[PDB]
Amino acid sequence: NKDMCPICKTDRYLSPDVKFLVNPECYHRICESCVDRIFSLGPAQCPYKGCDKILRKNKFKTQIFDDVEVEKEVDIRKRVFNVFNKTIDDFNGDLVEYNKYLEEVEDIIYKLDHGIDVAKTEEKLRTYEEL
Template identity: 50%
Template sequence: SGSCPECLIPLRRGNFRVQLFEDAMVEKEVDIRKRILRDYNKKEEDFATLREYNDYLEEVETIIYNLSNNIDVIETNKRIEQYKRENKEQILRNKTKLGRTENELQELLEMEKQREEERKLELAREELQLKQKKIRDKEALIDELMFSEGNAKSIVETFATSIQASNEKLKTAPVAKVTQFSSGIKFGQTATHNFIPPPIDDAPLYKYTPCVVITDGPPVPTWREIISRGYINHIKGETLQERAGGYKAPIACLRALQDAMGGLYDSAARRGETTAI
C-alpha cells in the first residue's frame, strides 16, 4: 500500500487486478461503471414515468463519464455521496431483490431447464418402450416358431416385415407437445404480483407531417428521372469502395441540380422590392 508518486492517490494492494482490456481508459471506465452501478441500482419499475427513468440513466452516464475523464471529480463525488444518503434504504432494498428483467431471465432459465429434463425423460421412456417391444417381438416370434405348423422361413419374413412397418410408424408419429411448466417459479405470475406495470402515457400520439421544401425555383428531377433521362451519362461513376459505403453517382447529380435550380425564381420584382443600379 502507498500513494502514487505522480497523482498522490492512495493505492491499496487489494484494489489491484489483472488488466482485461488493452486500452487502460476502457479498463478504468469499466471499473468505475461497476462501482457506480452498485449504488445506482434503481430499475424502471421504481419510477412513475419512463421520462424520469431515462433522466436517471442519463445522470448515471454523466457521472461515469466525469469520473472516467477527470471532469469535476470533487463535485461528482459529492453528488454520489448525497445520492447515497438520500436513497440509502432503497439501495439496500434493491440489492436484495431481483429486478423485472433479472426475474424474467431466471424464469426463462428455469423453463429451459425444465424442458431439458422433460426431454431427457421422454427419450428414456422411448428407449425403454423400444427395448420392451423388441423383447415382446422376440418372444412372439419364438412362440410362433414353436407352435405354428407353417414354414419357418416365411414366418420369420412375415415378422420382419411387420416389425419394419411398426418401426416406420414410430418414426413418422408426431411428437407430443410437452407442457411447459417452471420447476421453481411460475412463469407469468411472479412479475404480475411483484411488479406494477408503468402507467400508460395519455399524451397524443406523434403524427408525421411531410416536409414541404420551398426551393423558389423550377422542380428538380426525381431520382428515377435522373437515371432514365441520362443525367448521369457524363458523370464519373462511383467506385466499388464508394458503392460499399453507400455512395452512388445520382446523389452528386441530384445535389448539383438542386443547387443550380434553387432560387432561380427569387427576384426583387417578385418580392415587390426595387433594386438600385
C-alpha cells in the same frame, strides 16, 4: 509496453511468469512479482516514474480489457451502478424519467471518467449512497 513490465524489466519471452496486474487508482502495467515485492510490506507510491499515488496490494487486480481507458470507464461504472441502481420498476413504468435517469448516470460516469467535476460529483454520490 503491452508485453513487458517496466518496473522489474522482464520480458514475457524468457520469463512467462509475469501477469497483467493493474491498480484501480492508477492503471499501470506491473507484474505480480513487483506487486508482491513492493506492496507486501505496506502501501507505497506508484513505482511508475512521474506518478506518486498511494496504492494497496489487496486492491490490485488483473485487467480484463486491453484498453486502459475502457477498463477504467468500466470500473467507474461498476463503482457507480452499485448504488445507482434504479430500474423501470423503480420509476413505475415512467419511460421518459427512466431515460433521464440513464442520461444522468451516464453523465456522472463520464464526469468521473474525465475528472472535470470530480469533487462535486463525488460529494453527490456520497450523499446519494448515504440513503
